[PDB]
Nucleic acid binder design. Structure first.
Ligand SMILES: [Mg+2]
Lengths: 50, 227, 147, 75, 227
RNA sequence: AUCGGCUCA
DNA sequence: ACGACTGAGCCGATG
């Protein structure tokens, strides 16, 4: 189902896409998988651990 | 061997935020050198006008709130943070915002002062509900560069600040997005060539024009130890 | 002029403080510990330098020598005092003696994980990529022909 | 000696008497002045004891024979 | 608002080929801008004199060989490639090399012409064995920049060449290797800061010193349309 | 400070 | 018939 939704917003079915590197402004010699993810700032930062 | 020197052809204004910039002619293997090098300055650096300090009557700390207001203090600090501002002459400026009644609170409700020119006259700052209350506040705007938040400002000073003077982190850097294209230039002399198109998006606090000339100055400024 | 007068210049965060710090950390090593210390490499010495933050940094090879991993981990950090303590921390406990392992005749500090894939990606054989039939005039011409 | 002490270990012989030949030598150049021989390259008295072993000098044979010298100079 | 301006600290000569160059202080996110941008010029656009074309009597193609010679043609093409040459006036020059007998064949066996100055008078070109044979050849030297090999010279060109005129790839860039390091520099108010060390290797036709100052000039030279 | 509670390596 | 991990965090409660 996900594949068939990518062809709605037009983002490659492969999920890997072309990006460019900072430092250099020079290519990445292969498509890299990218996307949106739910992460956590779970408890105990560094501030309470040092 | 003689070096071609690239120039400006046309500036394509699309909005007070967005603008492309076309550049030709650049010799082979130079669209990658500069375009990248330009961008690296254009994000990292660049002197935009932004909000730093605020005071409000009837408020003690940021973590409290004011009656007849939908949004919280930190929320209004947060809405002030992402403001758009312009300054002509002096560096540091003190604004006065006074609005009262029902409905939203847009920036155009601040006193239009001489040097002061606002980019977005329909930006969201704060909300009001009850019609027997208002909000008066002294906001402070500054020109700097990069990101000196409130945190690094609580340890390079010892004369001490008063109560009510809250601190927003400063978003001095104006630009929010940038890229660069590498297309083939058709000059009517040589066909080997390329041309550099730099897309940008911003808050309008610095013009798309100066921005480019101002950054390449900084670039060269660094190169002055090797000539 | 006293120990206490210096107790104010330290706390004031005066600049000259950090100056001396750089020449103190110069030629004065450290002990770095991970529990469980199942064996002896669980402690080693590493000549530190300064880097600001709340966080400690480390090598990714000795990752394997220690019972270690970067995911939610912690290291206590002692300091060896006497001339001896320092030098014997350099002479023995230091990481530089511990490339070979105690238990057996294999080096414990080996190219773990990522450092690896670079070399495979690099060295990996082929027959067609970008051009061929070349020669080069030494190891130097190669680097030109890549970056 | 900041990177690797492999040359100065096998000079005296082992790594344990690279301590009590250098501890004794790191002690002598910390108290009553004492000479810095191989250029004091900023460094500190920590490395110096070992650094004298890296250029064909300090040994146990040279710290128990030259302590008789400071017992022939104070008469 | 004022920006830090980086300078030269020390030049560490190791050989007439190799040299590191240490640079401090550069603000955060600038060791990547210049070091890269510098390198891109330093390889692809620094005008050194190098070998391009050769003709030899008694030879048809590069894949064959000549009698009384230890080394092969491609091997002698390969030894010509990595030559050191100097030119004063004109751009393109035609050399004549004539040596005969036993032993090696160094460049000092070429006719010392006016504009022609050789850097290494004991470089290895070719070897001879039997003492009843010799080698005569017309070599061609040119000033360019970067790397236009033999391959791009056989393609998108229609001028037909004769038989015997072999092609070596051109090593115009005098530099043969370059990198750049990004280490930490420690000021007593910001710790983010860095210093730029540029390693290089070359044939000595240009000094490690001028090279850097000469390239950053070229860099800035391009930037002069935006100040 | 002994015990009890609960997390992360 | 015996024997019971190595680090420190935070809270709580009575000799
Ligand atoms: Mg783990």
């Amino acid at each position: 189902e996900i594949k068939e939704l990518l062809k709605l917003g037009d983002l490659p079915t492969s999920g890997q896409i072309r990006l460019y590197d900072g430092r250099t402004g020079e290519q990445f010699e292969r498509p890299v998988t990218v996307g949106y993810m739910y992460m956590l700032k779970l408890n105990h930062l560094v501030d309470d651990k040092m | 061997t003689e070096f071609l020197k690239p120039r400006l052809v046309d500036i394509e204004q699309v909005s007070s935020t967005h603008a492309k910039v076309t550049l030709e002619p650049l010799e082979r293997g130079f669209g990658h050198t500069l375009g990248n090098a330009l961008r690296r300055i254009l994000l990292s650096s660049m002197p935009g006008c932004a909000v730093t300090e605020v005071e409000i009557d009837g408020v003690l700390h940021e973590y409290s709130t004011k009656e007849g207001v939908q949004e919280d203090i930190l929320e209004i600090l947060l809405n002030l943070k992402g403001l758009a501002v312009r300054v002509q002459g002096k560096d540091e400026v003190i604004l006065t915002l006074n609005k009262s009644g029902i409905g939203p609170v847009t920036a155009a409700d601040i006193t239009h002062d001489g040097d002061v020119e606002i980019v977005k006259p329909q930006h969201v700052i704060c909300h009001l509900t009850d019609e027997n209350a208002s909000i008066s506040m002294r906001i402070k705007v500054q020109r700097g560069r990069g990101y000196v938040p409130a945190s690094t400002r609580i340890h390079s000073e010892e004369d001490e600040r008063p109560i009510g003077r809250l601190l927003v982190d400063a978003c001095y850097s104006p630009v929010e997005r940038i890229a660069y294209n590498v297309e083939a230039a058709r000059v009517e002399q040589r066909t080997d060539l390329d041309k550099l198109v730099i897309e940008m998006e911003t808050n309008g606090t610095i013009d798309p024009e100066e921005a480019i000339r101002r950054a390449a100055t900084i670039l060269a400024e660094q190169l002055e130890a090797f000539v | 002029t006293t120990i206490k007068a210096a107790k104010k210049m330290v706390e004031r965060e005066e600049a000259v403080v950090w100056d001396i710090l750089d020449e103190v950390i110069r030629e004065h090593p450290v002990l770095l510990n991970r529990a469980p210390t199942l064996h002896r490499l669980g402690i080693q010495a590493f000549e530190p330098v300064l880097i600001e933050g709340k966080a400690i940094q480390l090598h990714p090879l000795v990752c394997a020598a220690y019972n270690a991993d970067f995911d939610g981990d912690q290291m206590a950090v002692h300091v060896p005092l006497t001339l001896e303590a320092q030098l014997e921390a350099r002479a023995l406990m230091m990481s530089t003696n511990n490339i070979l392992s105690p238990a057996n005749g294999e080096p414990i500090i080996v190219p773990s994980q990522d450092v690896v894939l670079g070399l495979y990606y690099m060295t990996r054989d082929c027959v067609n990529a970008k051009g061929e039939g070349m020669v080069l005039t030494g190891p130097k011409e190669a680097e030109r022909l890549y970056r | 000696a900041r990177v690797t002490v492999q040359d100065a270990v096998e000079k005296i012989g082992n790594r344990f008497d690279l301590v009590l030949v250098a501890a004794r030598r790191a002690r002598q150049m910390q108290v009553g002045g004492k000479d810095p021989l191989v250029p004091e390259e900023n460094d500190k008295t920590t490395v110096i004891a070992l650094r004298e072993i890296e250029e064909g000098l300090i040994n146990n044979q040279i710290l128990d024979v030259r302590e008789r010298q400071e017992q022939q100079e104070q008469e």
